[PDB]
Every structure is written in structure tokens, then in C-alpha cells.
Design a protein around this ligand. Sequence first.
Ligand SMILES: CC(=O)N[C@@H]1[C@@H](O)[C@H](O)[C@@H](CO)O[C@H]1O
Ligand SMILES: *[C@@H]1O[C@H](CO)[C@@H](O)[C@H](O)[C@H]1NC(C)=O
Ligand SMILES: *[C@@H]1O[C@H](CO)[C@@H](O)[C@H](O)[C@H]1NC(C)=O
Lengths: 224, 224, 224, 101, 103
Amino acid sequence: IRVFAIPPSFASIFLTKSTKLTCLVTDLTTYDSVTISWTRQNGEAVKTHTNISESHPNATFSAVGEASICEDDWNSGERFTCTVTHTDLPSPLKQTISRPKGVALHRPDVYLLPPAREQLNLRESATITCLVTGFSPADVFVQWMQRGQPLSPEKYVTSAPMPEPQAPGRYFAHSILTVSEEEWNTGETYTCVVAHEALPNRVTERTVDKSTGKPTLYNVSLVM
Amino acid sequence: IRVFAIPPSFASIFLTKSTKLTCLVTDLTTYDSVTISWTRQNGEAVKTHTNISESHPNATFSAVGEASICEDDWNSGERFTCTVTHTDLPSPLKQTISRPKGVALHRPDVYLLPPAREQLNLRESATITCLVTGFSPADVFVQWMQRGQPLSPEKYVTSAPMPEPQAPGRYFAHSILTVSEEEWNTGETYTCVVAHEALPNRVTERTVDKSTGKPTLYNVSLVM
Amino acid sequence: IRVFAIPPSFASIFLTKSTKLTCLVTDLTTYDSVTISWTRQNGEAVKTHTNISESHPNATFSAVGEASICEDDWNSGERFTCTVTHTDLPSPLKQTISRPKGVALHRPDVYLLPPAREQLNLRESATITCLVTGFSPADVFVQWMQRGQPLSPEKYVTSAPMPEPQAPGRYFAHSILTVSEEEWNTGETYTCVVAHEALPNRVTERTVDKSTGKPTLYNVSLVM
Amino acid sequence: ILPEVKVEGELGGSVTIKCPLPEMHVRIYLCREMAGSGTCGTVVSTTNFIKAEYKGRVTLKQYPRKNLFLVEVTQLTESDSGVYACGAGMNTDRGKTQKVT
Amino acid sequence: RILPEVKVEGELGGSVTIKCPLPEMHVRIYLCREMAGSGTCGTVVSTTNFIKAEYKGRVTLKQYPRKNLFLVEVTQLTESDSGVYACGAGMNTDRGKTQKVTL
Ligand SMILES: CC(=O)N[C@@H]1[C@@H](O)[C@H](O)[C@@H](CO)O[C@H]1O
Ligand SMILES: *[C@@H]1O[C@H](CO)[C@@H](O)[C@H](O)[C@H]1NC(C)=O
Ligand SMILES: *[C@@H]1O[C@H](CO)[C@@H](O)[C@H](O)[C@H]1NC(C)=O
């Protein structure tokens, strides 16, 4: 008899270019007339849901509620009221959702580590690992592009941000891309794209290939 | 006899991080009562010209039509009507702008050309070039950066777009950032960051170093 | 009815070596023998008409005439007074124009930057860029001279001069020539020819090919 | 893989070659190897480049459902059957996928 | 450098089965595929759950501990100019190859 609400994540803001607000119904009976009201904190109702979902087999009845505003309107710290009233949940619903001001703001450092030589010696799939250090807002969107076009999200597996031990406020996250060994040995792009608020252009890139790790093996001098 | 409008550019959109719906009429009369109604195509007049300038018909509107709309579909999406009644106009001059939609979206191709050898030999200065060729809708926004620090716009100046010869629709642009030769001879990242609508996630940078052409595997030197 | 004065440009006085004062009339329809009267300051320069057309798409074509004087006369700085007499205009008149004097002369510095390695990697086309800096009668005429003589003007594109970042008076321009990769790869010299006032004898030539970057003394080749 | 599919031959005939289209929206091209340079040279690409010798005589076509990039040489002025190469990516030389003499 | 050449000529309809020797020291195995002039055999299948893209779905592995053999079967076996399909054990792939196999 409780309906959760989710504030949008910066990943979704970058992905869809537009801020979206959602309430998900949970633990209700199966019904059809469930309706949801999305309003701003000032009281003016924003555009409400469209094409609400159907019931849930696991008795956790779920419905779709959508509120669409730009990135700036959500950036304005606009609290929204989420109201649900129907027979299944007779009590009126009210929700308070915000974005935690007072946070720190550091630029993430993105280091792109090539696979270990042991991985290549297996001649099996090798893991490249964008390691994204010290970013305080703890909301980052790591992505991978090969040949200029992003790869499928199934191929790589970025982790959830965790605090960095040396500095409390800062965090870190790692993204692993498992790609074929033959693909790695043939000079590839393999770029890692990190999207974060503290970044100047809000998006940064790094590139690694077989050539980056190759050191200068010959120092020819030509004394004369 | 129409109300000129200055649509925000993707350069203005990216630098400002917001849209500034503007119908300050280049070439009109501003005697008095020149109301700008920043109406939407649905007839909802949202925020109109707030902070509008003075009543001066210097063969143009001194008074502004500028506002602050919301980008996402509030720059793109639909169109925005500006209905201007004058103190001498029974029929208010009206105009809607859909940010000239309908163009062909191409991704820019960015090449960083390092300073010429003769320029380095003169040792007076050096000019790094950021050639941006192949774009579709012609409105790119180029900035330079150094180790993640956005360089001041004073020391780099970028040409406006101009019809590529081989490809009719595509455009090209030059952003040259002029350093110091003693800055170039020591390693400095000097990244070029291009913000364009058609790029993957609208941004892509490419850096150049004094050691960017040198073959890596062998450090040939001449001792005399 | 509308009087226009088009002064000779340095490009014209370079290409034809004969300066060509231009005056034009607009807002009038083409009756017959369309022209603009011609005089110099002393009135001796009475010349003949050219560019006869029946009518504009709106049947109000601008009458065209031309006059010729010695090339050094325009650079002399004296005012030249061309009359304006045509059958359509109600009352003849005269206008005077001259080269704007008192304008610092700085020698152009010309550099040729070969296409980036990535552009050659695409193996589609390659842009050789002629960068002209530090010139300020705000005029430059750049053309491309390969294999002895002149390439078609469609191939190269020269940007309008744009005021430099550091040096206030001194400007710059860029002229890109787009040629297929195989000629570059082959070896082909492409000259760039900056005709300008502040130049010692008005013309400067520069040459770049595939072998300019390579060092001549040492030749280190890595073999597998 | 060297499935040179077409050594077809006519002064005015048209040869159509099917080409592997990976679909990750990468630039896909028809390339031609040159003996003197030793490096393959682009003749057709998703980027609108048409080689000097083949101006207007070659066309490209896309089928995502069939995953086919067809290259059509409509007038074979019987110039040298080259060892042509399908490839993808922004590196023409090393990005080749298949050969098609 | 033992060199069985199975040479199953079924082409599209063939289903090649090759039995390579097996140490039985619980070490991982692999079926190398000498990659086009690299020299580094790429693994088609192994004790590790990796199967190549090209040989996916059709390549299967079966064990014979008592017979000291590992049987790799390419069921579909659709033509792909088969080079030395070495089978070998060990964490290292190119060095650990034992039996070459030509198809
Ligand atoms: C002349 C030359 O190229 N040799 C250098 C030398 O200057 C340097 O001190 C040392 C270690 O960096 O060995 C070589 O790399
Ligand atoms: C070789 O390496 C040294 C290391 O300090 C460096 O100073 C030198 O510039 C290098 N040689 C060249 C030609 O750059
Ligand atoms: C210079 O080096 C290149 C590297 O491949 C080589 O091909 C060329 O022959 C060398 N020049 C001379 C004159 O041998």
C-alpha cells in the first residue's frame, strides 16, 4: 500500500536530455483506474502520466507516472507532489522529492588501463578498465564508444560509485569492457566517456589502444 | 514588415547552458508600447520579455524581446510565437520560430594541426589549428582546453562556418589557438573540444602534443 | 535611384593588373543602354557600359557600368569622383570615393600545414591549409599554385580575414585546399600564393609536400 | 576471408557486389588496393567520396534487415579488376573486412 | 609436434570431430586457430566458457578422462579455410599447444 518515487539520476539526464520524474506503485491489488497526479512545489500541475502500465503478476501492482521538465527546471530544485487516489489505495498520496544541495564538486579523473599481459596470453576475451577517480557528487555516467559509436550496454559493466579511502568526500567507479583479444591486438579505438556535473563541458573522454603502452625500446643517438 | 527574431544558437545554448528566446527586432520601430508576447505555438504566452531594454528606435528595437525559455523542446520541439503590438500597429506583428528544423545532421570531423616548423623556428609564437570539417547543420561551438582547464577566449579565435567545396551541404571551421613556443616545446595537452548537435553526445575533443607525430619506438638524437 | 559605390579590391587589381572603379544604381528598372556615368576627379575617365540585362526577376534590375584608370591611381589616395547619369533615374549626380589611407602595414607571415595523419588515414581526401597571419590593410588574396600553375578556384576556400587575438591591428586568414589523398601520398608540392600590399614585392610563395616534415640527415626505419 | 564474388566482365555491364554491413552505424566503404603504394585506396564510402576515375559510375545501397552494403559499378570501362576491399571504421587501410576481386 | 589432419570433407554438411590428447591434470585446454599471419593461435573453445564468435553455437567439447582425449566437434562446419587447429593445455595459449590439426 506504498508507492515509491524515484528522483532522476544524472545518467538519465544525460541520456534523455530531459529530466523525468516517476512514481512506481508497489504492493497493491490489480486494478485499471489507477491515476497519478504530478505537480510542482508552487502548486501548478505539470503534464501528467501517459499510457499507464498494467498489473503485476507478483501482486506488487505497478503503474507508470511521468512528469517531464527540462534539465534546468529540475536544476532549479523544483520539488514535486506525487498524488495517487484510487480504491486499491484509498488514502490520498503525497510525496516530497528534492536534490541534496550543499554537496561538494570535484572533477573526476579518468584513467584508461589496458588489459594485463596475462589476459592476452590466454588469447581469450580481455578486459579494458576505465577507472574513474575522485568525483564528489557520486553520480556519474560511464559509457564506451568504439569507432565513434557507443557499444551496447551489455558488453561493459560499470560499477556503482563507492567512497575513495584517502579522501572522504571524493568517490570512484570502474567500468570494465570485455572485448576479444584479437580485437585488442588490432589497433582499436576503445574510448571511455565519463559524464559528470563537475566536468567543465560535463563530458570527458579517454582513449587506449595497443600502441599507448608500447615504450621506446631503442634510443638511437648519432653522435658526430 | 515582420518581427525579426534571434534564435539561440547551439554555441549560445552550450555556453549559456540555457535557451534565450529572443525577438529583439533588428530593423523596426520602438516608439512606445511594443509588447513582446513570447507565446508558445499553443498560444500559451509564457514568460515574455522580462528585463527588456529602453525605448529607442535607432532604426531597430533597443527594447529587447529576449526571455529565458527551457531548451529540451523549448528551443527544439515546437515553435515559439512572438506577437508584437506597437503603439502604431492595430494588427500585432507575429512570428513563430522552430529553430530552422529540417536540416541534415552530420557529425563533425576534427583534426588538430600542430604549429608549422617555420613558426617554431621563428620562436616568436605558435598557432595550433582545430580544423572542423564535415558537419551537417552548420553551427558548431569550439573551445580549447589545457589539462582540463578551459582556456580564456582571448587567446583563441575561431572562424565562422563556411560551405565546404567538395560536399555542398557540409561545412568547415577553424579554431586557432595561439600559444608561446616555449609552451609548445614542453609537453602541453592543448585539447580541442567541439560541441555540435550531431556529435554522439554533442561533444568530442582531440588533443595534440609536441610529441604527437614522433614515432614513439625510438628517440633519435644528434649530438654535435 | 539608389547610389552604390563599389571600390576596387586588391584581388581584382592583382588578377587583371588594372584597377576598376565601380558605381551602380539600384531601385530602377532597365530601360535601355544601362550604365552609370563615368568621370574621375578631373572628369577624364569617361568609359563605356557593360553587363547589360533585360530585367530583374522583379523587373527592376540594377544598371551596371564600369570605368578604368591606372592601377597606381587607386593607391595614390586621391579622391576619385564618378558621375551618375542614367535614363531611369530622375536626376543625375556624382559621388567620390578613394582608398582609405592611414592604415598600418604589417608583412604577412605564411605557413603551410599538411593534412593530419587521421585525414590521410581515411584515404578519402586531404586538406592542406595556408595560414596567413600578421597582415593589416585587411586585405589578402590567396590562391594556390601547384605544378607550375593555378588550380581551379572551386577547389580552395579562403576565409574572410579576421582580427587576431593578441595583435589588435594584425589579422589572419585561412585557405584550405582539398585534394585526393593519392596525389599527396605520391608527392606533389602544392604552392600557396599570398598576394598582399605589405609584402616586399607584393607576392609570397610557400611550398609543402609529403617529404617536408621528414628529417633529411637521419633515416631510421623500424622493421619486423 | 577473400570471397572475391565478382570477376564479371563487360564493356557496359554493371557489377553488383554484396558487402558485410556491421550496422553499428560505422562508416562502411568500398576500397581499392594500389600496387605502387601497397595501401588500399577508398573508392566509395558512407561519407560521400567518389573516386576520380569512378565519378558517377558507382553507387552504394544499404539494407539493414539483410545486412548488405551493395556496391554497383554501372559502367565497367573494363579497367583493371582490382582486389577490392570491404571494411568499416575511419581507418580504411586496417579496417578491411572482406576482399572482392 | 604431432600433426593429425582430420580433413573432414563434408564442407557445409560435414560435422568435424577431432580428438586431441589430454594431460588430465585438470589444467584448462583450448583449440587454437592460427590467426591470419599473426602466429598467435586464437582459441576457438576452451575449458573456460569462452567460445569464438564465428565458431559459436556449432563448436562443442566432450571429455574422455579414461581415454585421455578431448573431442571438439564443429557441427555445422560450414567452410572457413581451416589452418592449423592446434589443441593444447595451459594458461598460456600459443606456447602450450601440443597437437596440430589441419582441416
Ligand atoms: C643522447 C641520447 O639520446 N641519449 C639519452 C640520454 O640523453 C639520457 O640521459 C639517457 C636516459 O634518458 O639515455 C638516452 O635516452
Ligand atoms: C629523448 O629523451 C630525452 C629524455 O629526457 C628527451 O629530453 C629528448 O628530447 C628526447 N629526444 C628527442 C629528439 O625528443
Ligand atoms: C627513409 O626511410 C624510409 C622508411 O621506410 C625508407 O623507405 C626510405 O628508403 C629511406 N630513405 C632512403 C633514401 O633510403
